[PDB]
């Protein structure tokens, strides 16, 4: 009886891999970024990286390698998915539109063999003869490369070496030759094997086995000039080739592990090296030309260049620009310099990329007291940690607000032929026109000489020769500024009132029904250039210099009335060019042409609230992209403004939208406002670069926010955040963080760098006497952070070796205060289970943090939750309730305990509890008879849980080590005493992410039921709703139809992909739906769209609407 729905709310921002090469064209350099399920494709250029194509996969990318097989134009791409889907891809730009074609594919799973530790490794011989995979212990799978094998039939070869750490193929080999570091009893060794794909053996290897360092872990294969292997370990780097051994041990490397590498120079004379600490190194190999005897390695050298952001990923791009792919922090572009600038760093950051890092914990808060949802996350680790604030929509902050109901139009107005600090604004009302003024922050209201004030205006712009245009409905008029006179006045030959305007700066194109007159503002007067009559009444018009001129508009756009059509015309003549009918019979409200970058655009808003869009040539005209993209229910009125570099289209309606530029596409964000109807840009002497806006009855003036559909603040903590609780009554946050300190001369801990907890505006330490129980330490602190500034107001440091594990903000018993309570644990040298910790009760009262109470406790406090007046806390396998006395004491009755280790814990506003103990989800309710918790229900079946939530009283969402989701439900059947004790898994779904936190909230609000947000390790935010019978069924339908149509990159079945997959089973998806997949219904060519939806009613335009109601869900 379970019907669920999951849409992505924010795509994964962490980077899992990145590879460089020539895959777009041989004449090009690309950077390829791997997400989880996304491949991002860039062209390296002068100004930086230009994005060409972003594609989705039905799999987590786990191997990503470019190669050129003999007689091949450009690089081909190899991708191995985590569920064992392989495939080779080609980039084909044939059409002015792009394609990732699958040259080959096939699934390389094996019924046998355990997943190797250190994971899937994918490698390719320099001769592109073959692909070597290392998927499982004992088994090395081979795929031959030759022009067929379009299914990638493979074979395995037994590998005697049980425990393989890393592998590459060697360069300069007269047969493929593998080179690996394996572990066995006596440490780790490097060994070679030839691959005889002819007979499928391993044969011997080119050179015998040697021992390596106990922590050897990276193998580098260096190309032909030198050819050999480099082995990076801890405290040692070594070159190996035949009987040539070179070894260095520079202490500079002895701290942090080396974690990634890239080669800079094809010769392979310089490699980049990435630490876990962000240190970047250059590895240099020095060459030796031997009076006629090739080149050899004389030595190796390392050199610290500076620091990045912990890197998964390091790609030397060109010209000393490295891309640093990061996962625990923001990714970034970086320039390596020859001279070490200030600080003595050779690394200078050019560019930074937002990663929500691991989202470790989060909470939703209506932060700026608007009935909306904002999200704040603990993100990153180490000297990369931060908070992130995530808000929905574009916003605007307000300067002045003046009331003036039933306005029907506005245009800006500078009062000088020089200075673009416009100082006047003029409102059109029903049949009036009142004029204003600006002394800066003020708005006084008298008119100018020659401005009709009993006529509704349809224009209030600027022209030529110290002159101010006013195309009122009465008559297109002219008023100069210095001459302050009516220098001209046009009227309609028949005394017919005017209808639709159109006015740039140096041109005019009115209309009086189906009629059209083209006038001119050349030296100080009006000039009737033209006149045509249209087939039907004119709804709307538009004219603006689209490039090759600066006032003289070459073409025009026009909305009609009966045939509901838009058209292009040549303006000195009005000669009908190309015209396009749209469906239906509601009128075009607005039409607009705009100059962006490399697609000249024109769009049309209708009046029911629909919009249609078409690019075109300012030179000629070609009917472009068609996808009806609704917005408000009110007729949208388009407009142009000025902003940052690129300037945009602002949709005016009940659903204020802004249309930006995506890939080279166009952005759709909500503007977080009540409703706008008319909106004009600005730059005044009271409100410079800004905007003007009129609602029902208000006028407003402010500055547009960022750009994206989600807007993201960052708060560098320079250390690790672990937990977060909002405190409304204190208007602040509580955050547990930790930092790494290290040995000093004193033996005591020092500090690697300043961080939140060391740089706080006020601080304090733990002075509890509760206990008498070269190296790295953790210091855990509790931070108090201001909800408005986000300054670290105060930071309490816990005791030596106290790790805080849980945090809560609540009231207790009858005490009216709200406290922050923190569950800790005492973490000694080598004692696995810890047997001590504390529950500390803190007070953040007027100004400072107060230590109220303490209670010692015998074990780690893994989780805690305020139940129904008491503090329910899980201490190391035991679950106890606590009482908050009136003396402010926390007490329990040691005889009322529990045999549960709740790594994860939630509560229903009743007497219920979702726990996890021995890999199992648990239901428990409070029995006051026994003062206990009673085990109402369980979910047998293993589940290495990572997170847990209550959906309602009988349904329970859960997430697990294998990237699957599942819902548990209690049985509604007899045997209430057996069948009742087994709750059951009514829904399954392979998410592809690792969930750290669920929480009840939304980022939408000022169709479906409920909403729970979750945060990933990859920084992905998601959302889950409940549905009905009809939808889950309609949608389930939709999906199956949708797979049939939709192309799928490496030929992968969405059905395989989404099916719940562990080690103990693989069942198909139940009770779930990915809105992700549903939403791509709107991203379809109507042809395909009429295939799906071949039958409740049964229409595309019935359905195109259904999906949009869900897009509004986040």
């Amino acid at each position: 009886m379970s019907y669920n729905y999951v849409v992505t709310a924010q795509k994964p921002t962490a980077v899992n891999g990145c590879v460089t090469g020539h895959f777009t064209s041989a004449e090009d350099l690309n950077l390829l970024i791997a997400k989880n399920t996304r491949l991002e494709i860039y062209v390296v250029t002068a100004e930086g990286l230009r994005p060409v194509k972003e594609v989705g996969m039905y799999g987590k990318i786990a191997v990503m390698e470019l190669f050129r097989p003999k007689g091949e134009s450009k690089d081909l791409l190899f991708i191995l998915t985590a569920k064992y889907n392989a495939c080779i891809l080609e980039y084909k730009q044939s059409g002015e539109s792009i394609d990732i074609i699958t040259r080959a594919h096939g699934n390389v799973q094996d019924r046998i063999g355990r997943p190797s530790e250190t994971g899937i490794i994918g490698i390719i011989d320099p001769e592109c003869r073959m692909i070597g995979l290392r998927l499982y212990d004992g088994l090395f799978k081979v795929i031959p490369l030759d022009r067929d094998n379009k299914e990638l039939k493979a074979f395995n070869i037994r590998l005697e070496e049980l425990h393989v750490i890393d592998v590459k193929f060697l360069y300069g080999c007269q047969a493929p030759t593998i080179c690996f570091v394996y572990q066995d009893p006596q440490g780790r060794h490097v060994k070679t094997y030839e691959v005889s794909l002819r007979e499928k053996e391993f044969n011997k290897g080119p050179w015998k086995q040697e021992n390596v360092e106990a922590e050897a872990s990276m193998v580098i294969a260096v190309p032909e000039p030198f050819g050999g292997a480099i082995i990076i370990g801890q405290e040692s780097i070594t070159y190996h080739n035949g009987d040539k051994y070179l070894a260095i041990a520079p202490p500079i490397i002895k701290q942090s592990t080396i974690v990634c590498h890239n080669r800079v120079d094809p010769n392979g004379s310089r490699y980049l090296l990435g630490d876990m600490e962000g240190r970047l190194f250059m590895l240099l190999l020095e060459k030796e030309e031997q009076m006629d005897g090739t080149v050899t390695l004389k030595d190796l050298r390392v050199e610290l260049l500076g620091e990045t952001s912990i890197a998964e990923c390091l790609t030397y791009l060109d010209n000393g620009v490295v891309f640093v792919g990061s996962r625990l922090g923001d990714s970034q572009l970086v320039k390596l310099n020859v001279d070490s600038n200030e600080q003595g760093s050779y690394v200078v950051a050019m560019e930074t990329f937002t990663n929500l890092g691991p989202i470790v914990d989060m909470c939703v808060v209506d932060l700026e007291r608007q009935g909306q949802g904002q999200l704040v996350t603990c993100s990153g680790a180490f000297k990369e940690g931060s908070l992130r604030i995530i808000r929905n929509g574009i916003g605007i902050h307000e300067h002045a607000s003046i009331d003036l109901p039933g306005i029907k139009g506005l245009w800006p107005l500078r009062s000088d032929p020089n200075r673009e600090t416009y100082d006047t604004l003029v409102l059109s009302f029903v049949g009036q026109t009142r004029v204003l003024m600006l002394n800066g922050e003020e708005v006084e209201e008298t008119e100018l000489m020659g401005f009709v004030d009993d006529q509704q205006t349809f224009f209030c712009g600027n022209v030529a020769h110290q002159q101010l245009i006013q195309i009122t409905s009465a008559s297109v008029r002219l008023v100069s500024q210095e001459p302050k006179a009516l220098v001209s006045e046009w009227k309609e030959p028949q005394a017919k009132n005017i209808s639709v305007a159109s006015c740039n700066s140096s041109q005019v194109v009115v209309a009086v029904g189906r009629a059209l007159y083209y006038l001119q503002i050349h030296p100080q007067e009006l000039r009737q250039i033209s006149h045509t009559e249209m087939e039907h009444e004119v709804a709307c018009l538009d004219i603006t210099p689209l490039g090759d001129s600066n006032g003289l508009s070459p073409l025009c756009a026009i909305g009609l009335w009966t045939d509901i059509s838009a058209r292009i015309l040549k303006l000195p003549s009005f000669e009908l060019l190309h015209k396009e009918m749209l469906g239906g019979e509601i009128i075009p409200r607005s039409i607009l042409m705009t100059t962006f970058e490399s697609s000249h655009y024109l769009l049309c808003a209708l009046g029911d609230g629909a919009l249609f869009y078409f690019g075109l040539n300012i030179e000629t005209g070609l009917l472009s992209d068609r996808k009806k993209v609704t917005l408000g229910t009110q007729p949208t009125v388009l407009r142009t403004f000025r902003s940052l570099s690129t300037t945009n289209v602002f949709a005016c309606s009940d659903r204020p939208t802004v249309i930006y530029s995506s890939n080279h596409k166009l952005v759709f964000s909500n503007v977080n406002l009540k409703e706008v109807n008319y909106m004009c840009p600005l730059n005044s002497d009271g409100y410079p670069d800004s905007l003007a806006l009129a609602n029902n009855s208000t006028l407003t003036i402010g500055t547009i926010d960022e750009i994206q559909k989600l807007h993201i603040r960052t708060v560098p903590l320079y250390e690790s955040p672990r937990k977060i609780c909002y405190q409304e009554v204190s208007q602040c946050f509580g955050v547990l963080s930790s930092r790494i300190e290290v040995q000093d001369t004193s033996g005591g801990t020092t500090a690697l760098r300043p961080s939140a907890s060391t740089q706080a505006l006020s601080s304090s330490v733990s002075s509890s006497k509760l206990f008498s129980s070269g190296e790295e330490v953790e210091v855990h602190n509790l931070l108090i952070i201001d909800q408005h500034t986000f300054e670290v107001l105060h930071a309490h440091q816990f005791l030596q070796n106290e790790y805080a594990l849980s945090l809560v903000s609540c009231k207790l018993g009858k005490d009216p205060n709200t406290y922050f309570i923190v569950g800790t644990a005492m973490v000694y040298p080598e004692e696995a289970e810890p047997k001590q910790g504390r529950i500390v009760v803190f007070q953040y009262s007027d100004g400072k943090l107060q230590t109220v109470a303490e209670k010692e406790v015998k074990g780690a406090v893994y989780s805690m939750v305020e139940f129904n007046g008491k503090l329910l806390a899980s201490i190391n396998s035991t679950v106890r309730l606590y009482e908050w006395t009136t003396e402010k004491d926390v007490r329990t009755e040691c005889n009322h305990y529990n045999n549960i280790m709740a790594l994860y814990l939630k509560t229903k506003g009743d007497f219920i509890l979702v726990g996890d103990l021995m890999r199992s989800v648990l239901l428990l309710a409070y029995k006051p008879m026994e003062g206990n918790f009673e085990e109402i229900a369980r979910d047998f079946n293993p589940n290495w849980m990572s997170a847990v939530e209550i959906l309602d009283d009988d349904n329970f969402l859960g997430a697990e080590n294998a990237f699957n989701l599942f819902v548990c439900q209690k049985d509604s059947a007899a045997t209430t005493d057996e069948e009742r004790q087994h709750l059951q898994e009514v829904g399954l779904f392979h998410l592809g992410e690792f969930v750290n936190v669920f929480c009840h909230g939304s980022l939408v609000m000022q169709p479906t039921q409920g909403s729970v947000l979750f945060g990933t390790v990859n920084g992905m935010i998601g959302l889950v709703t409940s549905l009905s019978e009809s939808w889950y069924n309609l949608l389930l339908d939709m999906q199956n139809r949708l797979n049939k149509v939709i192309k799928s990159v490496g030929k992968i079945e969405h059905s395989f992909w989404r099916s719940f997959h562990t080690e103990r089973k693989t069942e198909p998806a139940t009770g779930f739906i990915d809105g992700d997949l549903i939403e791509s219904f709107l991203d379809i060519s109507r042809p395909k769209m009429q295939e799906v939806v071949a039958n409740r009613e049964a229409t595309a335009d019935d359905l195109i609407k259904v999906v949009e109601e869900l897009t509004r869900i986040h």
Partner: peptide, 14 residues
């Protein structure tokens, strides 16, 4: 020890 292991898992099994 369970905590550090846990905090690891949360960051990416590191």
């Amino acid at each position: 020890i369970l905590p550090k292991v846990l905090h690891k898992r949360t960051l990416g099994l590191s």
